[PDB]
Amino acid sequence: AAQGSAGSMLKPQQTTTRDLISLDGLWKFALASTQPWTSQLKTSLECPVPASYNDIFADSKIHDHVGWVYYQRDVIVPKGWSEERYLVRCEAATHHGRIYVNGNLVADHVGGYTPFEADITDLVAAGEQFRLTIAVDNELTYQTIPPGKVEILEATGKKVQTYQHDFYNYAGLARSVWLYSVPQQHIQDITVRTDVQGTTGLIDYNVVASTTQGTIQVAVIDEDGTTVATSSGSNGTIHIPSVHLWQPGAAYLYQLHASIIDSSKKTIDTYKLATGIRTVKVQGTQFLINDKPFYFTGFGKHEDTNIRGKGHDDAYMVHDFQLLHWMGANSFRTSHYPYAEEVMEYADRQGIVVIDETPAVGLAFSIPATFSPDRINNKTREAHAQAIRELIHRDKNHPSVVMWSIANEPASNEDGAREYFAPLPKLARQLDPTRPVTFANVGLATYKADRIADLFDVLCLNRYFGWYTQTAELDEAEAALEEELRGWTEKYDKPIVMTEYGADTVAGLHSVMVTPWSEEFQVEMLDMYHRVFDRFEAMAGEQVWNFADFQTAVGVSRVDGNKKGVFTRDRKPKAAAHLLRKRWTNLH
Amino acid sequence: GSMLKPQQTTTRDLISLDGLWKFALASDDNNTQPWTSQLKTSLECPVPASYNDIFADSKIHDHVGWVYYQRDVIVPKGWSEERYLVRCEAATHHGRIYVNGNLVADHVGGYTPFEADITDLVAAGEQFRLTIAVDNELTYQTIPPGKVEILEATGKKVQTYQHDFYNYAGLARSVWLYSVPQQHIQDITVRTDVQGTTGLIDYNVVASTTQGTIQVAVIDEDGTTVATSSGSNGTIHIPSVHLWQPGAAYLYQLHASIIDSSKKTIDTYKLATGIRTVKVQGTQFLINDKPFYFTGFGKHEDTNIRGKGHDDAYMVHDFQLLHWMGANSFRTSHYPYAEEVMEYADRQGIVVIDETPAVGLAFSPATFSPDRINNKTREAHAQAIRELIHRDKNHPSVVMWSIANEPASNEDGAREYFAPLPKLARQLDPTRPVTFANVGLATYKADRIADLFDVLCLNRYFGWYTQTAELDEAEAALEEELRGWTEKYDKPIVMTEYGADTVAGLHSVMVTPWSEEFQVEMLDMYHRVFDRFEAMAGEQVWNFADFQTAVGVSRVDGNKKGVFTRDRKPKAAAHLLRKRWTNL
C-alpha cells in the first residue's frame, strides 16, 4: 500500500488454471481488550463473515465498541497447490484491516471498501494448516476517509465515535474473504477502453503479467459463445464488426478471454473478464451514452439490510434490482462508499447505470472551519486520493459505471475547499480518461456560494427545500428550487443531476392534509420537484433520496435511522414507490 | 369581568349553544364588517370543537387572523323580569361577541371565560343573530407569544411561535345563554382548613345588591345538611369532617341562597367543595398534613379531529386511564383546561397543577426586552393569573398554580419580569403554593428566578437531548443536577416533565431511541435516581398521550413523547408506569 498508486489484483475467479476457495462462514470473534493473533481464540462468540458485526450479537457492548476486533479461523492450503502461487484476500475490511498468518502480520490496509490481499506462498506450504486471524478496527479520525473523531464521556468515560455522515458506522468483514491460487506466471491486471468507429466497435486493452514468460492471447467472445475477434500482445486494440453496444436498458456483454500462452502453443494462465462497449461524453448541458442523450432515473442507495447491516447480500441485491426494473429506474449512485464488486458486475448484466462514489462523505462540519490543519488537511486529502485510486483501479472496467463521484456533501463553499479539491478530479480524469467527473453538492454551497463546481464535468445537486428550508411549504419551496436551478443553469454550461431529494416517511402514516412524515407528503414533494425539473432543459437526471430506509447514528431527529426511503428497510413500497413507477415507466 | 360557571337552579336558567354554527374566515372583500350581515359561507363548524383540522382544507387550517362563527338564538319568553347573558367558556386567543351587529364583549385571554349581560339588547321571547369573531394571531404581547411573518416568495402569512404544541384556534369550549335573577349571586369563595378531626370552611359570597340576606346550607354526600350559616360571609366548622383525599374524593355541597325580606329564595347556587389543606414545609408537600408524592403526567387538550375542543368521553376515559395505571395527579399543560375537567377531577380525587397559558417566553436573541417580552407582555401575563385563579380558586383538586412553562429563567430581565407574578398569585390565593416549570438550560447555577417560588418544578430530558442514547451517562448528569438543586434550595422538587419520544410498534432490544423499549428504560432509570433523592416530591411523565404540534422535521406528525397514543392506546411505558405507581 504505497502513496500515488494501487496494488490489488483482478477479482479472483476460478479457471482451468486458477483455483478459488471461500473463507466465508462463522469465525471466532472477540473484542480488543492483548495480541490475540499469536494463539488460538477463546470465545463461544462466532460472527458470520460477509456481514457487519454491530447488529449481529444483540449485545450493547459489542455494538458500541470503539477500536479493534478480531476474526479468526483455521485454514488449510490444499495439497494440490504447490507449484502454484497462492494468497489470501479480503474484498473489504470494515475500515482498517490487518491479516495475520499464524501470528505474523502479512497485510495492513486503510481503505474500508476496497480489496486487499497478501501473497502467502513462501509462508505456508501446500497441505499445511495455519491460523488465519484478521483484525478490523472501526476507528475514524480526521485523516481517515470517512472523517471523524473518537471522544470520551466526561462522567462514565465511555468511548464514543463521532462523525458527520447520516448512515451508521457499521464495522467488520462486510465482504467475502477468499483463499485462492494463481500460476507463477499470471495475469494481474487488465484495462479495457471501449470506443466506436461508425458501426465498428474497438476496445483498447492492456494486460499485466507477473513475469515475461510466453505471450498474451486474447479471444473476444459474444453472448452466444462464438469468438468474434482475437489479438496478441500485452496490448493493442480489438476491432468488432457491427458491435452489439451495451445500452442503458439493454445490456450486451462480450467476454474478453485473456490468456498467457507459454513458449509453445499451450495455455499457462487464463482469465475471463466481461466488458460491454459504450462511450460516455458530456457535450455542454447533455449527457451522452453512445452519442444519444441520457437522463438518469433512480436513487442513491446504501449497503444496509436488517441484521448483517452493511454486509453484501446476494438475494437483497437481486431483489433490489428487480424493484428498480419494476419501477423503470435506470440508474443509482453508490451512496457514500463503493459497494461490493459483485453489485457492479450485476449492474452490468442488468443494464443499470452507476454513479460510483468514493467513501468521502461528511467532508464538512456544518450538518468550525472544515479545511485546515485540524480537521481536513493534506494528510486527509492524501487518503482521499488514496481511495480514488483503489476505486478506479477496481472499477475502471464496468460498462455500467458511467461517472465518478469524488465526494458527498463536502464543505465546498468554504475558504480552503478549492485548494483541497483541485488535484482530485484531475487525478480521476487522468487515471481514467473515459468517464466524466463530479461530486454531489450540498444545499449550503449554492450556485453563488460554491467555489468548487467549475472543476467538475457534471453538476450533482442534493436539495431538500420542501423539508429543511420551506418546511411543508411546497409552494414557497417551488420558489426556492427554481431560484436555485436558474442560478446553476445560468452560471454554468454543464448538465445537472439531482442526486438527492426526499422526505422522511413512516409507512402507514397518512394524512389528507399537508403533513411531513406522511406517505402523502412524500408523494407531494417528489411530485412538485419533478414538475420543476421538466421546466429546465438543462437537467440530465433525477435520483430520489433514498431507495430504502437505513440505519444511522443514534439521533433525536432520526427515527431509528433515516426514513427518506421510498421502500422500507424490509423493501416494501411506500406511496412514493408507485409515483416513481408511474413517472418513470409512462414517459421517456 | 366573569362570574360563577352558569348553572340551572330553581331561579337560574341555562341554554347550551353548542352545535353547528355557520363558519367563515375573514377575507379582504368589500365585506370588511362581516358581523353585521349573514355570512357568505356554506361551511358549518361544530362548536365545542376547534376549527383547523375540521374541514380537511388547508387554507382554513393554515389561516392567520380572524374567523367568524354565526347562528340565530332565541331568548325564551319566560326569561323576562329576569336578567340574561351570553357566555363563552373560552375562545382561541382573541374573542369578540357580537349581538345583533353590536360589539358586546372583547376578550384577550385564550383559555378563560368571557360574557355579556344582554338583557336590554334583546327582548325576552325574541330571536337574535349571534356572531363570534375569533382571532388566532399571537404577538410579543399575547400570552403565548409569537410573531406573524410573510413568506418572501409566495406572500403567504405564517404564524411563528415558541411552544411545542400546535396553535389550534376557535371556540374550543361551550357557549351559553343563561338567566339570572335581578338580584343574583356573582362570585363565591371557599377556603378549607383542617383543625384536627374537624373541617372548617370560610365562605364569601358577592351578590348584585344588598337587600334580603344571604343564607348558606352545607349538605353531605348523603343528602343531610351538616352545618348552617347566615351572612354574606362567615366561617363553618364540620364535626368529624369527611376529608377530600388524593386517593378518595369527598365533596360537600355548599348551597348559597339569597333570602329576601320574607322567607322566600330569590336566588341560589350549588357549589361543590372538598375539605383539604396544602402546606409546603421544608422539602415536603403535605396534603392534609401527610407527605405527598405526585404521580402522573403533564397532559394536553388535544384529540383527533376536534383538536383542542373539550370532549366528555375522552375526558372520562383519560381519568379512567389514570386510575388504571395508578396515577394521582397531572398538570394542565401550558393552559388552564376546560372548567368541567377541574370539576371532574374534584369528583375523581385527582390532584391538579393549574398552569397559565404562558409558554414560549424563550427565544433559544435576548428574550426579556422592550422588543420581545416587555412590561406590556407582563401585564397580559398578570391578567391570565387573575383570570385563572378567579375561575379555579374553589377546586379541592387544584393544589398548585404554575406561572409559566420553560421560560428563559436564566437570561437577564427574567428576574425583573417574574418578580411581581408569584407575589400576585399568593395575594389572590394564600391557600396554595406557587411554581413554574423550569427549563433544562436554567440549571441550578444559571437560573435566577427559582428562589421566588414555593415548589421546584423541573423537566429534564438528558437521556434524550444531552446523553442521547447514553443512559449511564445521562444518569450521572441527572443526579448531578439534583444534588445541585437540593443542595442549593430548601424546597420540594417535582419532575414536572421528562421522558423520550416513541413510535408505537417500533421495537428494539438494544439502546435505540424512538423504540417503545427505549422509553421504558429512560423512564425507569429516572425513577431509580428519583428514589435516591429524599427531596423529591413527585414525578410527572411528559406526556399522557401523543399530541399535534407545529410542523417540524424533527416532529413525527406531532409530539410522540406520549405514554399513550393520540387515540389513547398503551405504549410499553404505560405498563411500566402502572406497575410502579400502583405497587409502591
PDB file of C-alpha atoms in Angstrom, chain B residues 272-391:
ATOM      1  CA  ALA B 272     -69.092  21.684  45.468  1.00  0.00           C
ATOM      2  CA  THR B 273     -66.168  21.863  47.898  1.00  0.00           C
ATOM      3  CA  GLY B 274     -63.788  19.306  49.246  1.00  0.00           C
ATOM      4  CA  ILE B 275     -62.101  19.890  52.549  1.00  0.00           C
ATOM      5  CA  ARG B 276     -58.343  19.622  52.363  1.00  0.00           C
ATOM      6  CA  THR B 277     -55.212  21.679  53.123  1.00  0.00           C
ATOM      7  CA  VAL B 278     -51.966  22.277  51.215  1.00  0.00           C
ATOM      8  CA  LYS B 279     -48.739  23.035  53.097  1.00  0.00           C
ATOM      9  CA  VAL B 280     -45.172  23.037  51.856  1.00  0.00           C
ATOM     10  CA  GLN B 281     -42.749  22.662  54.769  1.00  0.00           C
ATOM     11  CA  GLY B 282     -39.070  22.187  54.061  1.00  0.00           C
ATOM     12  CA  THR B 283     -38.768  19.879  51.056  1.00  0.00           C
ATOM     13  CA  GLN B 284     -42.200  18.434  51.689  1.00  0.00           C
ATOM     14  CA  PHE B 285     -45.562  18.737  50.041  1.00  0.00           C
ATOM     15  CA  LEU B 286     -48.259  17.909  52.563  1.00  0.00           C
ATOM     16  CA  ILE B 287     -51.865  17.330  51.681  1.00  0.00           C
ATOM     17  CA  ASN B 288     -53.859  17.327  54.895  1.00  0.00           C
ATOM     18  CA  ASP B 289     -50.625  17.207  56.906  1.00  0.00           C
ATOM     19  CA  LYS B 290     -49.224  13.962  55.437  1.00  0.00           C
ATOM     20  CA  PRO B 291     -46.330  13.779  52.907  1.00  0.00           C
ATOM     21  CA  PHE B 292     -47.486  13.552  49.274  1.00  0.00           C
ATOM     22  CA  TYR B 293     -45.928  12.398  46.022  1.00  0.00           C
ATOM     23  CA  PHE B 294     -47.240  13.477  42.627  1.00  0.00           C
ATOM     24  CA  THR B 295     -47.564  10.596  40.271  1.00  0.00           C
ATOM     25  CA  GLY B 296     -48.952  11.290  36.821  1.00  0.00           C
ATOM     26  CA  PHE B 297     -48.497  13.335  33.695  1.00  0.00           C
ATOM     27  CA  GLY B 298     -48.469  16.644  32.055  1.00  0.00           C
ATOM     28  CA  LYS B 299     -51.452  16.309  29.705  1.00  0.00           C
ATOM     29  CA  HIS B 300     -52.870  18.270  26.758  1.00  0.00           C
ATOM     30  CA  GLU B 301     -56.265  19.325  25.461  1.00  0.00           C
ATOM     31  CA  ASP B 302     -55.769  17.514  22.187  1.00  0.00           C
ATOM     32  CA  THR B 303     -57.823  14.883  20.412  1.00  0.00           C
ATOM     33  CA  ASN B 304     -58.222  13.760  16.889  1.00  0.00           C
ATOM     34  CA  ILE B 305     -60.467  15.934  14.785  1.00  0.00           C
ATOM     35  CA  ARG B 306     -61.887  18.398  17.249  1.00  0.00           C
ATOM     36  CA  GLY B 307     -58.324  19.404  18.107  1.00  0.00           C
ATOM     37  CA  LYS B 308     -58.288  21.316  21.430  1.00  0.00           C
ATOM     38  CA  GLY B 309     -62.046  21.028  21.754  1.00  0.00           C
ATOM     39  CA  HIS B 310     -63.462  19.773  25.013  1.00  0.00           C
ATOM     40  CA  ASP B 311     -64.675  16.220  24.921  1.00  0.00           C
ATOM     41  CA  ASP B 312     -66.695  14.450  27.646  1.00  0.00           C
ATOM     42  CA  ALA B 313     -65.781  10.941  26.623  1.00  0.00           C
ATOM     43  CA  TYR B 314     -62.042  11.393  26.197  1.00  0.00           C
ATOM     44  CA  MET B 315     -62.190  13.242  29.498  1.00  0.00           C
ATOM     45  CA  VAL B 316     -63.810  10.355  31.337  1.00  0.00           C
ATOM     46  CA  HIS B 317     -61.638   7.752  29.615  1.00  0.00           C
ATOM     47  CA  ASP B 318     -58.414   9.741  30.244  1.00  0.00           C
ATOM     48  CA  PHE B 319     -59.095   9.765  34.046  1.00  0.00           C
ATOM     49  CA  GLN B 320     -60.060   6.105  33.885  1.00  0.00           C
ATOM     50  CA  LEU B 321     -56.611   5.599  32.430  1.00  0.00           C
ATOM     51  CA  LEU B 322     -55.021   7.487  35.339  1.00  0.00           C
ATOM     52  CA  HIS B 323     -56.858   5.156  37.643  1.00  0.00           C
ATOM     53  CA  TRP B 324     -55.898   2.115  35.597  1.00  0.00           C
ATOM     54  CA  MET B 325     -52.224   2.965  35.962  1.00  0.00           C
ATOM     55  CA  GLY B 326     -52.283   4.338  39.497  1.00  0.00           C
ATOM     56  CA  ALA B 327     -51.598   7.975  38.542  1.00  0.00           C
ATOM     57  CA  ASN B 328     -52.801  10.531  41.080  1.00  0.00           C
ATOM     58  CA  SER B 329     -52.146  13.897  39.506  1.00  0.00           C
ATOM     59  CA  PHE B 330     -51.471  15.945  36.428  1.00  0.00           C
ATOM     60  CA  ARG B 331     -50.562  19.311  35.081  1.00  0.00           C
ATOM     61  CA  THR B 332     -52.833  21.448  32.896  1.00  0.00           C
ATOM     62  CA  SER B 333     -50.031  21.715  30.372  1.00  0.00           C
ATOM     63  CA  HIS B 334     -49.484  25.192  29.036  1.00  0.00           C
ATOM     64  CA  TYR B 335     -53.029  26.478  29.519  1.00  0.00           C
ATOM     65  CA  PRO B 336     -55.861  26.036  32.031  1.00  0.00           C
ATOM     66  CA  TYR B 337     -58.088  23.264  30.678  1.00  0.00           C
ATOM     67  CA  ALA B 338     -61.892  23.413  30.490  1.00  0.00           C
ATOM     68  CA  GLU B 339     -63.747  24.215  33.724  1.00  0.00           C
ATOM     69  CA  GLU B 340     -65.609  20.928  33.778  1.00  0.00           C
ATOM     70  CA  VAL B 341     -62.347  18.955  33.868  1.00  0.00           C
ATOM     71  CA  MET B 342     -61.412  20.609  37.107  1.00  0.00           C
ATOM     72  CA  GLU B 343     -64.864  19.872  38.458  1.00  0.00           C
ATOM     73  CA  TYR B 344     -64.452  16.270  37.287  1.00  0.00           C
ATOM     74  CA  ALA B 345     -61.014  15.990  38.939  1.00  0.00           C
ATOM     75  CA  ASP B 346     -62.713  17.032  42.207  1.00  0.00           C
ATOM     76  CA  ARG B 347     -65.212  14.198  41.914  1.00  0.00           C
ATOM     77  CA  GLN B 348     -62.367  11.901  40.864  1.00  0.00           C
ATOM     78  CA  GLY B 349     -59.862  12.581  43.659  1.00  0.00           C
ATOM     79  CA  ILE B 350     -57.197  13.620  41.162  1.00  0.00           C
ATOM     80  CA  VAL B 351     -54.753  16.341  42.172  1.00  0.00           C
ATOM     81  CA  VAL B 352     -54.085  19.194  39.735  1.00  0.00           C
ATOM     82  CA  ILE B 353     -51.241  21.614  38.995  1.00  0.00           C
ATOM     83  CA  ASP B 354     -53.004  24.533  37.349  1.00  0.00           C
ATOM     84  CA  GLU B 355     -50.796  26.220  34.755  1.00  0.00           C
ATOM     85  CA  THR B 356     -51.368  29.533  32.958  1.00  0.00           C
ATOM     86  CA  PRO B 357     -51.162  29.778  29.233  1.00  0.00           C
ATOM     87  CA  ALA B 358     -47.660  31.274  29.431  1.00  0.00           C
ATOM     88  CA  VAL B 359     -45.229  29.120  27.385  1.00  0.00           C
ATOM     89  CA  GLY B 360     -42.552  30.155  24.926  1.00  0.00           C
ATOM     90  CA  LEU B 361     -41.199  33.145  26.820  1.00  0.00           C
ATOM     91  CA  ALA B 362     -37.909  31.997  25.360  1.00  0.00           C
ATOM     92  CA  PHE B 363     -36.024  32.721  22.136  1.00  0.00           C
ATOM     93  CA  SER B 364     -33.387  29.900  22.034  1.00  0.00           C
ATOM     94  CA  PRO B 365     -31.709  36.646  20.783  1.00  0.00           C
ATOM     95  CA  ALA B 366     -32.347  38.421  24.166  1.00  0.00           C
ATOM     96  CA  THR B 367     -35.890  37.461  25.215  1.00  0.00           C
ATOM     97  CA  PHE B 368     -36.687  39.938  28.002  1.00  0.00           C
ATOM     98  CA  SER B 369     -36.588  43.426  26.487  1.00  0.00           C
ATOM     99  CA  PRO B 370     -38.684  46.274  25.064  1.00  0.00           C
ATOM    100  CA  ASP B 371     -38.930  44.190  21.885  1.00  0.00           C
ATOM    101  CA  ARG B 372     -39.833  40.579  22.665  1.00  0.00           C
ATOM    102  CA  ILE B 373     -41.268  40.321  26.179  1.00  0.00           C
ATOM    103  CA  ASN B 374     -41.757  43.716  27.825  1.00  0.00           C
ATOM    104  CA  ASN B 375     -43.926  45.207  30.575  1.00  0.00           C
ATOM    105  CA  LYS B 376     -46.887  45.049  28.255  1.00  0.00           C
ATOM    106  CA  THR B 377     -46.377  41.303  27.876  1.00  0.00           C
ATOM    107  CA  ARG B 378     -46.076  41.142  31.650  1.00  0.00           C
ATOM    108  CA  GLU B 379     -49.365  43.000  32.018  1.00  0.00           C
ATOM    109  CA  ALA B 380     -51.091  40.284  29.976  1.00  0.00           C
ATOM    110  CA  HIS B 381     -49.254  37.581  32.000  1.00  0.00           C
ATOM    111  CA  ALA B 382     -50.669  39.009  35.261  1.00  0.00           C
ATOM    112  CA  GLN B 383     -54.099  39.172  33.676  1.00  0.00           C
ATOM    113  CA  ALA B 384     -54.042  35.463  32.982  1.00  0.00           C
ATOM    114  CA  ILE B 385     -53.059  34.771  36.587  1.00  0.00           C
ATOM    115  CA  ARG B 386     -56.032  36.859  37.680  1.00  0.00           C
ATOM    116  CA  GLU B 387     -58.484  35.091  35.414  1.00  0.00           C
ATOM    117  CA  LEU B 388     -57.064  31.646  36.040  1.00  0.00           C
ATOM    118  CA  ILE B 389     -57.194  31.987  39.823  1.00  0.00           C
ATOM    119  CA  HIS B 390     -60.577  33.790  39.804  1.00  0.00           C
ATOM    120  CA  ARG B 391     -62.156  30.891  37.908  1.00  0.00           C
TER     121      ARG B 391
END
